[PDB]
Amino acid sequence: FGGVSVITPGTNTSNQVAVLYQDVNCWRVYSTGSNVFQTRAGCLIGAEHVNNSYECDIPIGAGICASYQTSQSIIAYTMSLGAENSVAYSNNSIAIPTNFTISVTTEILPVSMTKTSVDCT
Amino acid sequence: SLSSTPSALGKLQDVVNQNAQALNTLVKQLSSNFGAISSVLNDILSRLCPPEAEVQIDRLITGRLQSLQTYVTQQLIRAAEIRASANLAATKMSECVLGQSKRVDFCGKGYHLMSFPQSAPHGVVFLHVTYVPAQEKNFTTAPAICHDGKAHFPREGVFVSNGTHWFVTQRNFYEPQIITTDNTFVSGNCDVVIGIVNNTVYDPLQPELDS
Amino acid sequence: MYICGDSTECSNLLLQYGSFCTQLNRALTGIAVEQDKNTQEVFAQVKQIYKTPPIKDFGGFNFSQILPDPSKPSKRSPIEDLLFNKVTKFNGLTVLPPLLTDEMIAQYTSALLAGTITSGWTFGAGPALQIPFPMQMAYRFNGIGVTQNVLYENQKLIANQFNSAIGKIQDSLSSTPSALGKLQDVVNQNAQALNTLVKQLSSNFGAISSVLNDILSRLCPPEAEVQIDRLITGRLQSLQTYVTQQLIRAAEIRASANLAATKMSECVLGQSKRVDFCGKGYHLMSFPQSAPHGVVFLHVTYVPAQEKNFTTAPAICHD
Ligand SMILES: *[C@@H]1O[C@H](CO)[C@@H](O[C@@H]2O[C@H](CO)[C@@H](O)[C@H](O)[C@H]2NC(C)=O)[C@H](O)[C@H]1NC(C)=O
Ligand SMILES: *[C@@H]1O[C@H](CO)[C@@H](O[C@@H]2O[C@H](CO)[C@@H](O)[C@H](O)[C@H]2NC(C)=O)[C@H](O)[C@H]1NC(C)=O
Ligand SMILES: *[C@@H]1O[C@H](CO)[C@@H](O[C@@H]2O[C@H](CO)[C@@H](O)[C@H](O)[C@H]2NC(C)=O)[C@H](O)[C@H]1NC(C)=O
Ligand SMILES: *[C@@H]1O[C@H](CO)[C@@H](O[C@@H]2O[C@H](CO)[C@@H](O)[C@H](O)[C@H]2NC(C)=O)[C@H](O)[C@H]1NC(C)=O
Ligand SMILES: *[C@@H]1O[C@H](CO)[C@@H](O[C@@H]2O[C@H](CO)[C@@H](O)[C@H](O)[C@H]2NC(C)=O)[C@H](O)[C@H]1NC(C)=O
Ligand SMILES: *[C@@H]1O[C@H](CO)[C@@H](O)[C@H](O)[C@H]1NC(C)=O
Ligand SMILES: *[C@@H]1O[C@H](CO)[C@@H](O)[C@H](O)[C@H]1NC(C)=O
Ligand SMILES: *[C@@H]1O[C@H](CO)[C@@H](O)[C@H](O)[C@H]1NC(C)=O
Ligand SMILES: *[C@@H]1O[C@H](CO)[C@@H](O)[C@H](O)[C@H]1NC(C)=O
Numbered sequence: 001f002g003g004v005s006v007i008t009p010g011t012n013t014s015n016q017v018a019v020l021y022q023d024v025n026c027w028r029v030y031s032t033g034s035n036v037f038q039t040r041a042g043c044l045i046g047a048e049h050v051n052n053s054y055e056c057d058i059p060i061g062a063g064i065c066a067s068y069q070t071s072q073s074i075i076a077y078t079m080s081l082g083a084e085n086s087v088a089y090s091n092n093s094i095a096i097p098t099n100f101t102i103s104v105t106t107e108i109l110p111v112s113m114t115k116t117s118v119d120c121t
Numbered sequence: 122s123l124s125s126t127p128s129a130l131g132k133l134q135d136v137v138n139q140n141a142q143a144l145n146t147l148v149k150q151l152s153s154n155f156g157a158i159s160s161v162l163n164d165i166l167s168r169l170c171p172p173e174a175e176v177q178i179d180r181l182i183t184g185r186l187q188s189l190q191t192y193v194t195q196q197l198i199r200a201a202e203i204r205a206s207a208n209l210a211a212t213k214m215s216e217c218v219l220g221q222s223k224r225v226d227f228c229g230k231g232y233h234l235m236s237f238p239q240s241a242p243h244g245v246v247f248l249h250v251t252y253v254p255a256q257e258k259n260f261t262t263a264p265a266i267c268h269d270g271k272a273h274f275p276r277e278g279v280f281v282s283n284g285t286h287w288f289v290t291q292r293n294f295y296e297p298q299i300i301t302t303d304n305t306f307v308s309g310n311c312d313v314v315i316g317i318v319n320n321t322v323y324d325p326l327q328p329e330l331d332s
Numbered sequence: 333m334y335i336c337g338d339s340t341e342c343s344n345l346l347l348q349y350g351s352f353c354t355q356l357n358r359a360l361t362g363i364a365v366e367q368d369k370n371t372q373e374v375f376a377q378v379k380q381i382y383k384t385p386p387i388k389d390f391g392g393f394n395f396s397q398i399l400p401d402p403s404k405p406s407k408r409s410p411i412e413d414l415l416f417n418k419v420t421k422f423n424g425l426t427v428l429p430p431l432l433t434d435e436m437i438a439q440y441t442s443a444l445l446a447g448t449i450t451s452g453w454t455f456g457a458g459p460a461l462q463i464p465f466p467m468q469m470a471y472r473f474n475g476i477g478v479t480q481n482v483l484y485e486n487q488k489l490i491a492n493q494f495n496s497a498i499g500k501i502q503d504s505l506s507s508t509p510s511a512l513g514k515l516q517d518v519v520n521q522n523a524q525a526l527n528t529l530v531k532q533l534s535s536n537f538g539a540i541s542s543v544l545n546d547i548l549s550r551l552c553p554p555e556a557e558v559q560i561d562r563l564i565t566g567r568l569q570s571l572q573t574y575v576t577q578q579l580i581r582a583a584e585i586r587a588s589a590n591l592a593a594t595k596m597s598e599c600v601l602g603q604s605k606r607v608d609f610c611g612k613g614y615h616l617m618s619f620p621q622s623a624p625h626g627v628v629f630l631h632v633t634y635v636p637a638q639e640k641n642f643t644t645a646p647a648i649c650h651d
Contacts, residue, residue, distance in 0.1 A: 001333070002426060022426060041429050059368070062429040063436060079431075081439050085380040087462050089450040091389045092316070094262040094279065095461035097254035098295040105229045105251070106122070106129070109210040110136045110244040113203050116144070116196075120189065150350040156561075188350060191572075198579055205587075225602035226377070227594075231457055254458040264467060264484050274480050279467070292471070308481040315466075315487055 002042065007058055009068035018046035018066060018074045037076060039064050047076040054080055133244045139199065147192045155184025210245050214238060217247060254293065263287075263318040266300060267311035273322050276306050287320045301325050333424025334533070335567040339544050341553075342560050352568060359575050363582045368431045370589035374627055375432070375440040375620075377596055382446035382455060391466040392491035395449060397498050398619050398630065400442050408438050408622065411630075414505055415623040419515045423533055425526060437622045444600060444620055456601030469616070475603045476614035476634055494632070501630060515626045521581065529574045537566025592627050596620060599629060 002022030009016065021029055026036060026043030037044045041061030056065035056079040065079045123129050154160045157180040158169070165177045217228035217236040228236055231251030239246040260281040266273040278289045281297065288297030289304050298304055301323040311317050336342030346353070387399060400407040408416065416434075432440075447455035452468045454461040466487055470480040483490060505511050536542045539562040540551070547559045599610035599618040610618055613633030621628040 001421075001424070022428070056431075059431045061431055063431070063433045065431075079436075081376070081436055082378070082380045082443075085382050085460065087382060087385075087446070087450040087455075087460050088259070089385045089389075089462050091391070091464050092261055092263070094260050094281065094463050094467070095257040096260055096279070096281065096290060096295045097257045097293065097458070097461070099255040100294070101253050101255050102234075103229075103231055103251050103253050105249050107213075107229065107247045107249060108130065108132050108241070108244060109213070109247075110133055110203055110206045111210055112207065112243050113136055113199070114140050114243075118147075118189065118192075146351070146355070153350045154348060155350065156348055184350065191355070194576065198583070201583070223605070224598055225453070225456060226597040254454070254461070257459060257461055262464065262467065264464075264470070264480075274484075308479075309485055314484045 007044075007047065007060070007066050007074060009074065014068060014072065016046070016068070016074055018044060018076075020044050020060060039076070044076060047074045049076045051077075053078045056080075130241070133241055136203065136243055140196075143192060143195055143199070147188060150188040151185065153184060154181075156180045157184075206244075213247060214245070217249060258295065260295075263316060265311075265314045265317045266305065266320045266322060267317045268320070268322040270311055271307050272309045272311050272314050272317060273300070273305040273307055276304060278304065287318070299323055334529075334571060335564055337423070337544055339548060339560070341548065341556065342544060342564060345557070345561055345564055349564075349568070352572075356571055356575050359579060363578055364428055366582060366586060370586060370593075371430065371432055371437070373593045374589055374596060375437055375444075375622075377593075377601060378440065378443045378447060378455065380460075381439060381443040382450070382460060383443075384446045384449060389465075390449065391464070391469070392488060393465060394491075394495040394498070395445070395619075397502060398621065399445060400438065406435065406438070407442070411502060411505070411628075412438065412441070412622050414502060415512065415621060415628060418505065418509065419512050419519070419624045423530065425529070434622070434624075441620055441622045444596075448600060448617065448619060453602045456597070472603055472616040473634075475605075476616065478634070497632075498630070512623070515623055518585065518625055522578075525574060525577055525581070529570060532570040533567065535566060536563075538562045539566075588626075595629060596627070599631060 002024060005020045005022070007018040007020060018035075019031065020041070021043040022041070024043040026038040026045075029036075029043050029045065031045055033046045035046050035048050037047060037049045039060065039062060041064055044060065044064075044066075047066050054065075054067065054077055057067040059065050059079075060076070063078050064076055066074055066076050068074055152160045157165070157177045159165055159177070160181065162178065162181060165174050165181075169177055213228065213236075216222045216224070217233065218238055221235065222228045222233050227233075228247075229249030229251045231253040234250045234252055236247050236249045239248060260283065262282070263280050264274070266280060266287065275289050277291065278298075279292050280287060280289050280300070281295075282288065287300055289300050290297050300320060303325060305322060335346065384399065387396065397410045400409055401413070404413065406413075447460055449465065450462055451460035452463055452471070454463075466483065469490070470483050473483045474480060534542045539547070539559045541547055541559070542563065544560065544563060547556050547563075551559055595610065595618075598604045598606070599615065600620055603617065604610045604615050609615075610629075611631030611633045613635040616632045616634055618629050618631045621630060
């Protein structure tokens with residue numbers, strides 16, 4: 001047994017969905033649509049697994065995310081943690097900026113919520 | 122960004138949505154029977170005969186009391202989350218707006234210069250202005266310069282070198298200076314520092330003493 | 333599954349209550365989401381995965397017990413391997429996996445160390461800029477009010493004191509099992525909350541039997557309804573108690589996670605002047621290590637040692 005969840009690209013884009021069974025040895029599922037993939041997070045049906053990692057969009061669990069990509073269909077992939085960067089470390093070498101930019105960013109915090117009162121009678 | 126990306130204000134929209142749902146739930150739980158013959162107190166009062174009405178009324182009371190206790194407990198927990206956010210927002214205004222902060226990534230990514238608050242429904246928006254180093258170059262370095270057997274260290278800077286010459290720059294910006302006795306200070310001899318290199322440290326006054 | 337165990341009669345009686353399944357499940361879902369958010373905020377503070385050079389030429393400083401061990405099946409440092417080895421459904425209870433597996437946490441931690449070691453704090457504020465490790469230390473020394481002369485003249489001593497301190501940490505974590513008690517306690521409290529939920533399930537709560545199947549098998553339908561309802565009330569109270577406790581506990585974890593995230597930004601991706609925030613003594617630098625359900629920070633501080641008594645004066649009078 002387990003819960004069932006639906007992986008949905010927004011409906012303002014497409015109506016294809018993939019369905020995840022949380023704890024099934026993916027066998028033990030009566031659904032169709034092919035594209036049956038077994039993961040640590042459950043039985044995923046309808047998403048195409050690919051070997052191309054990418055930035056996470058809709059998370060599934062256990063390192064797996066899904067997205068709607070090329071026409072287009074839902075795919076499953078291992079999430080990337082970012083681009084690699086090998087720093088040219090050396091005992092006699094330093095990098096120094098010769099220019100700069102000014103960046104302004106935005107941070108948002110809640111301060112308050114609606115104040116209510118309830119008459120119990 | 123704020124105009125084209127509606128998710129930008131999702132934090133404030135979420136506070137509104139959660140409280141709206143807590144109230145809508147309270148309202149809808151009200152219409153459940155909770156084991157009573159009817160959820161409408163007036164139906165019980167209008168047709169059921171008084172001693173039986175007492176029993177059915179009491180079933181509704183228990184159900185409604187549980188609904189209210191659940192609502193209040195949830196509002197107390199949610200209120201605590203809002204208070205924590207408000208305390209953080211107040212801290213940030215004192216430290217990011219009424220000063221300059223050295224706390225890393227506290228007042229935005231990059232080196233903080235200043236911030237400007239803006240009002241928003243049920244919250245505050247901070248515009249954080251930061252300095253970000255841009256295009257860099259690869260320079261050769263050394264911990265010290267060996268002049269006449271004495272070891273010279275920068276007072277405020279880093280020794281760097283291009284393919285043929287040694288200069289001293291400020292750490293965060295490539296603005297090379299001639300290495301002089303005004304830019305460096307002396308401590309110890311040339312044998313103790315590992316990786317010390319030979320250069321000429323210029324005495325800015327000697328030429329006047331010589332002339 | 334928790335309350336009725338697929339009993340049809342019980343489910344139909346649950347429909348006479350308010351929308352309690354929706355609220356219990358949504359509250360637990362909200363917690364589950366928050367738990368990935370906490371992990372993401374604490375560890376994913378670096379946008380690129382920085383890698384180290386072959387580990388050589390760091391001024392004599394030895395980082396081998398904090399950096400990943402290439403010989404293992406899981407690329408964790410010797411300290412992380414120690415931390416991981418030391419910390420220890422019938423009713424509808426499902427355990428969900430994290431989004432970031434231990435392997436991904438290890439990669440984020442490794443990236444942060446690579447950044448800290450080869451570019452100081454610049455990988456934080458802007459692009460990573462390479463710097464010789466000893467110069468990085470020189471700047472960290474100026475940052476505590478000690479000049480650069482001290483580091484270079486004593487570079488060999490400093491590297492040796494540093495290297496010995498790291499070895500001491502491994503011995504401490506290995507020999508003192510209480511060292512990781514905070515993480516073990518989080519595990520133990522949640523395990524107990526679930527075990528309690530499971531055991532409350534078998535109480536009668538005023539019913540003739542706690543086994544719904546006994547009621548259904550021998551008791552005649554109108555009487556079964558009464559006994560089933562007694563069990564439903566008891567089980568609902570058990571679930572509401574469980575969820576409320578998880579919400580409170582979740583809040584405590586969130587506060588800890590917010591602090592851990594703050595500390596990484598301020599202790600690891602910079603140098604901090606906040607007293608006793610990044611350890612006792614004058615802070616020079618810190619190195620994170622992964623642990624089950626948490627983060628371990630190794631904080632490197634400068635501590636003044638043997639002092640002497642000198643006479644002083646506020647000023648000197650010359651002419
Ligand atoms: C430039 O570096 C060289 C070392 O590479 C220094 O040479 C030494 O100088 C001392 C003092 O006169 C002698 O006793 C050593 O025998 C020299 N070493 C060698 C290998 O010959 C030289 O003095 C440095 N120049 C300056 C201005 O400091
Ligand atoms: C390192 O910087 C120095 C200083 O700018 C460069 O030397 C000067 O080059 C200009 C021509 O561009 C000449 O007119 C000056 O007389 C030079 N100054 C000195 C003191 O020689 C030097 O070429 C740069 N080195 C490299 C490899 O780029
Ligand atoms: C960092 O310190 C460790 C010890 O804590 C060094 O480990 C030694 O490595 C060699 C070569 O693999 C082994 O033969 C020794 O037996 C190891 N020592 C111990 C006590 O087990 C490591 O080489 C040092 N690394 C650097 C760069 O200095
Ligand atoms: C400052 O303290 C350090 C120890 O923290 C002293 O270094 C030790 O000196 C003894 C005696 O020569 C050696 O056996 C140890 O191996 C040294 N320790 C290390 C880590 O190298 C140092 O001599 C003291 N120094 C002063 C006042 O200069
Ligand atoms: C050393 O300290 C003494 C005070 O203890 C200074 O003496 C005074 O100097 C002024 C200026 O010449 C005289 O008007 C006072 O009468 C002196 N005091 C006494 C008690 O005689 C002396 O000038 C100081 N030395 C220096 C270099 O500043
Ligand atoms: C599914 O069952 C087979 C045995 O029939 C087993 O070999 C396999 O590892 C199981 N897969 C999962 C995900 O449990
Ligand atoms: C520094 O040198 C390395 C050599 O591998 C090169 O990849 C890097 O782009 C250079 N950096 C700059 C700022 O020129
Ligand atoms: C850097 O390493 C090279 C090769 O071992 C050595 O010759 C040089 O002196 C070192 N420089 C410094 C500053 O340690
Ligand atoms: C300073 O003098 C006092 C005199 O009572 C003595 O107790 C103390 O140990 C001395 N401190 C040092 C560092 O020598």
